[model samples]
Target: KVFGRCELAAAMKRHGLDNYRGYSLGNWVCAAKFESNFNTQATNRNTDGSTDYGILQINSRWWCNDGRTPGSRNLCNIPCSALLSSDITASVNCAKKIVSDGNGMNAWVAWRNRCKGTDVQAWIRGCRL
Candidate 1:
């Protein structure tokens, strides 16, 4: 799983975003690497609110969908590749949006904190490639 780094970077560059902080990418890159499409459009579901789609895996629960209803949209408003648009800064901003949505990433983080130990290094090391 490549995390769509190259595709995401090229698309983001075309749109104008050129910088991705190490820490930011670190968090996302590893997760993408573990998933199936490896960096292609990431369509995933989480027990909590963080559902991602597309290259940077834009978590749709916050930006476009609300799960209050059964048929609520889930990362369907925009394509995953759109996250690379030049208008945005780093994919980190998009990630932040999911985490800050109050019910998405933050919730995921709590899950991760428990599922994955507090030590990030340990999680990465133990995580299978």
Candidate 2:
């Protein structure tokens, strides 16, 4: 539901992601913009039959379960719907765990493909924090 980059940046900062796991807030913001545009409920169906959930677009293949998706790993130990909440705490925690699993932000394809090496400053340019 965030309507502006600054708003999104503030939320990210409040969630303690300004420089988490050596990844910059700008990069996180960039990834979020490209992944879900800060829409908490966003989801995309991958052609491989896995669905990406929430703002970070975490995949059901290894992260969360949609209940209907058979063989979902549910490594986050949460239902996929949990990621769609506006609260974002659970999503952030799960995302942190995902990064710690050694994938880093690379686990998010949007970060690896679009945000990396790009003009990331623009993602948080006008934010005071």
Candidate 3:
């Protein structure tokens, strides 16, 4: 696991993701919680036959290449496995790039289903960031 609630908040603050894309720390925290539960190695098989990687659950269809997956656009120019690491730099950076395309957190289904227009303070509660 790359983070608990407290550790994640501090690390994200240092990485400048706390407010990227006008999304708050709470938004990022809540997304991560629902997507991966703060586990960097988390992954899920989407019904579209693509895999979502890392804490942000970036998909192989557009964001990364997993080698086995064919025709990945790989906009991040990164291997999906690279995101499954304790160091979250690549994952966070890729997430930032994805949001830059105007999708914001809505790119993530978890964010849309659970985080949008919700009070997410509990995701970072007691963290002094």
Candidate 4:
């Protein structure tokens, strides 16, 4: 997802949430890595494209049915191939846009980190990307 540290941090600020208590930078970097391995163009498979298509490996057809945005629904649905073809920043940013839009990047980011970055919640809270 597009859940960058600076942006995530900003989002928390907007919501009046705490800035990670203490693990700010760690939270930020951890989030960056968790999202797309910090690769941006990261992608996976739906060998069963029967359901998914792109990066981040989203699996709901309803979300990307119109080609609006793959990760918008799920990164996997979009496929790494598409991300690679389009460019590195494209997929990562796409993930960012979807997650930051009050959609679910935070939850997803948190999930990806699996509490790894919570120690540095401050940094995660300060994310801007």
Candidate 5:
């Protein structure tokens, strides 16, 4: 699913992303915009051979086991393919695990470069959350 901005915002909030670990819903929304543009089918292969999957772009190197990423920890204990579904539940769950795993939202370079330390509230301004 290619979610609209407000639709993604509401979905993430419903999945407990709002203010999770001191990061606001806006922060998450902003990250999603830059990461995958809210497209559930989005995927990006890293130069190191790991791949980022789904809307939040969960990486295969540590978060998921794609079987092709050498030495994958699969810390989320999920198949990387699960992140590609339009349901987005697994993606959101794995994202939470990533943040709670001490990487925080900084795990996403998009978040660091585009969302972090910015007026993130702008991302959710008209979402009516």
Candidate 6:
């Protein structure tokens, strides 16, 4: 499923991403925008044989089990396929785990290079809540 900017912001806020670990809802929105364009089924294969899945593009090497990434820890303890679901519950939860594990939003380079320290407010402008 693809989400509009505001729609994804609303969903991220609803799922507890608002101000999560000191990052604003706009930060999450901005990250998703650059990471996957809000596409739930987005996937990217890395040169290291790892893959990133879902909107935030949680990685296979360290987060989810794709049965292909070498030395996968499955820290989220979820199948990589689960991250592609439109429900987004699993994706959101796993994202929380990724942040809680001390990576914070920096786990996503898109967030680091694009969303970080930028006026993320623009991403959610005019969106209600």
- What is the lDDT of every predicted structure here? 0.43, 0.85, 0.88, 0.42, 0.92, 0.93
Candidate 3 lDDT tens digits, 1-129: 768888987778788897898988899989998899999999999787789999899999999998766666899999999999899999999999998998778898889999998988777788886
Clash count for candidate 2 is 0
Indicate whether candidate 1 or candidate 5 has the larger TM-score.
Answer: 5
- Candidate order by decreasing lDDT: 6, 5, 3, 2, 1, 4
Query: Model 2, 1-129: lDDT tens per residue?
Result: 553788878888899887799888888888988899888899999887899988888899889988766776999899899989988777888988898888788988879999888878778876788
Q: Each candidate's TM vs. the true structure? A: 0.40, 0.92, 0.94, 0.36, 0.96, 0.97
Better of 4 and 5 by TM-score: 5
Candidate 2 segments whose C-alpha is farther than 4 A from its true place: none
lDDT of 3: 0.88
User: For candidate 1, what is the lDDT?
Assistant: 0.43
Report the C-alpha lDDT of model 1 over 14-127, residue by residue, as the tens digit. Answer: 443322332333344333344323445446676765566544555554554534334445433444445444433434445554555455433444235442333333323433
| True-structure RMSD, every candidate | 7.7, 1.3, 1.1, 8.4, 0.9, 0.8
Ranking by TM-score: 6, 5, 3, 2, 1, 4
Give the best candidate by lDDT: 6
Q: Cα deviation of 120 in candidate 3 (Å)?
A: 1.7
The better candidate by lDDT, 2 or 5, is 5
Overall local distance difference test of candidate 5: 0.92
Q: Give per-residue CA lDDT, model 6, range 25-122, as digits (tens).
A: 89999999999999999999999999999999999999999999977789889999999999989999999888887778988999999989999989
lDDT of 4 by residue, 32-99 (tens): 45545444344544343434223343334433333433444443354334544323343444544454
Q: Which is the better candidate, 3 or 6, if ranked by lDDT?
A: 6
Candidate 3 versus the native: TM-score?
Answer: 0.94
**Runs off by more than 4 Å, candidate 5:** none
Task: Tell me the deviation in Å of residue 46 in model 1.
Answer: 8.4
